A = this chain, B = another copy of it.
Amino acid sequence: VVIDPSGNTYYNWLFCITLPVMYNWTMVIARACFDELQSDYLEYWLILDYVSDIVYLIDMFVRTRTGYLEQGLLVKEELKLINKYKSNLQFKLDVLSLIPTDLLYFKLGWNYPEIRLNRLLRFSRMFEFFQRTETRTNYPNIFRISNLVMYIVIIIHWNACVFYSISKAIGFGNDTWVYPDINDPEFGRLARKYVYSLYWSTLTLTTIGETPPPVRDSEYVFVVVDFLIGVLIFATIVGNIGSMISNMNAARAEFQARIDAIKQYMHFRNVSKDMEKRVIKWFDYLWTNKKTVDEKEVLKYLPDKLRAEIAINVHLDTLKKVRIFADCEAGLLVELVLKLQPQVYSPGDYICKKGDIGREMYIIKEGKLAVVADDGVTQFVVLSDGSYFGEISILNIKGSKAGNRRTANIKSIGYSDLFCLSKDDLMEALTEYPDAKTMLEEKGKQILMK
């Protein structure tokens, strides 16, 4: 065997089947409308159509060999897959899109390729590929815009073909509206035919209108309907363009809107230009160093038993340098990684101060912190990455003259990325295995006596 739709093989086949479906959606109508296209390159159209039909058949086979999830397990029983396929509307659409209507080439002649129009009924495969690509691609907005542009181009191409067909029905050159006479040297070339039809279609759907006005009632009606199709469908698609660009700007726009609200508040309250500059510097840091997004709000949509792995694969850089995690229990790190709230501190920010509520443990992910003196400048100890502080005031200790108080003040030399671990959480998670707690308050007593 089976294909496992989640796999890469299924996605690759989705591409390989979208190619014929897109080809069919673009070219069947073109060949049906522009007769010279069908006739001049008939030897190539036959090859391409037969290859497309072969790929359609192989796609039907793949649909027979693609497993589905019952009880969460991939069904691998062949006949079960055949039944699941045939019971779905997709099998009906596939049989309809693979009906050998090409036999009508013997009746209607080689000049009627619209018999292959049923081949469009595999559009679903194409759309599936798109909805898969949009999910799996690393450039979701580039692909989304390319998809919208493809839809625009297909719509304009189809409307060009429709215009040319209507000109044919009315008669080429019978009036100033229809496509001019084919017998003209310049206006008889297939290139000119298609490109002028596309020009007309673009002017009509984009509602520019710089085309000869209608002459007949059918022409007036078609032009009204087509200008309305233009207005509505092009507003739809080119406003989807707008929404895609909006969601492209979503993060940056939200960040900038927050900054603007802050600046409005500061200018209204006449906040000192010192503090205004400090705030602007904080936000410039958040942007430049790519910290505007908070991983919590993003990863909250992941499963906890997958967001856990995510956090591990991101923070194993530091949670191996820490003494508590991955050293004593070697598994405890998972119990708290999904609750280590990542904070960022500016240079000179006092994370801790003597005589404060010690309700948070900190793990230094990045940055240089200092166990300073209360004078403000004298740096007693420099804590680099992997260090952990703020854990002594969490625990119950014998001989602690300072209970629930910070034993020292910790300031940040530079921008520090820390993991604030709350006291309640450390309490709750160390209950399972105190084999790490013993050396934890080993460190605790050792630092509380000195």
Contacts and interface: CB of A to CB of B under 8 A. Distances in A.
Interface of A: 5-6, 69, 71-74, 131-132, 134-136, 138, 140-141, 149, 152-153, 156, 189, 191-192, 195-196, 198-199, 202-203, 206-211, 213-214, 217, 220-221, 223-224, 227-228, 230-232, 234-236, 238-243, 245-247, 249-251, 253, 256-269, 271-272, 275, 278-285, 287-290, 293, 295, 298-299, 301-303, 305-306, 309-310, 313-314, 344-347, 349-351, 355-357, 366-368, 384-385, 412-417, 432
Secondary structure at the A interface, as helix, strand, loop or mixed, is helix
Nearest to A234: B231
Given A141-B260, A156-B224, A278-B306, 5 more contacts: A207-B207, A208-B227, A265-B295, A269-B314, A275-B310
A338 to B, nearest CB: 14
Contacts of A247: 253, 257, 260
A259 to B, nearest CB: 6
A264 to B, nearest CB: 7
Contacts of A136: 280, 284
A261 to B, nearest CB: 4
Copies of this protein in the complex: 4
B279 A310 contact: yes
A253 B213 CA distance: 40
Nearest to A301: B258
Contacts of A366: 71-72
28 contacts: A5-B284, A6-B281, A6-B284, A69-B415, A71-B414, A72-B347, A72-B413, A73-B414, A140-B259, A189-B217, A195-B224, A202-B228, A207-B207, A209-B209, A209-B210, A235-B238, A239-B242, A240-B245, A240-B249, A243-B253, A247-B257, A250-B257, A258-B298, A262-B299, A271-B314, A303-B344, A303-B345, A305-B351
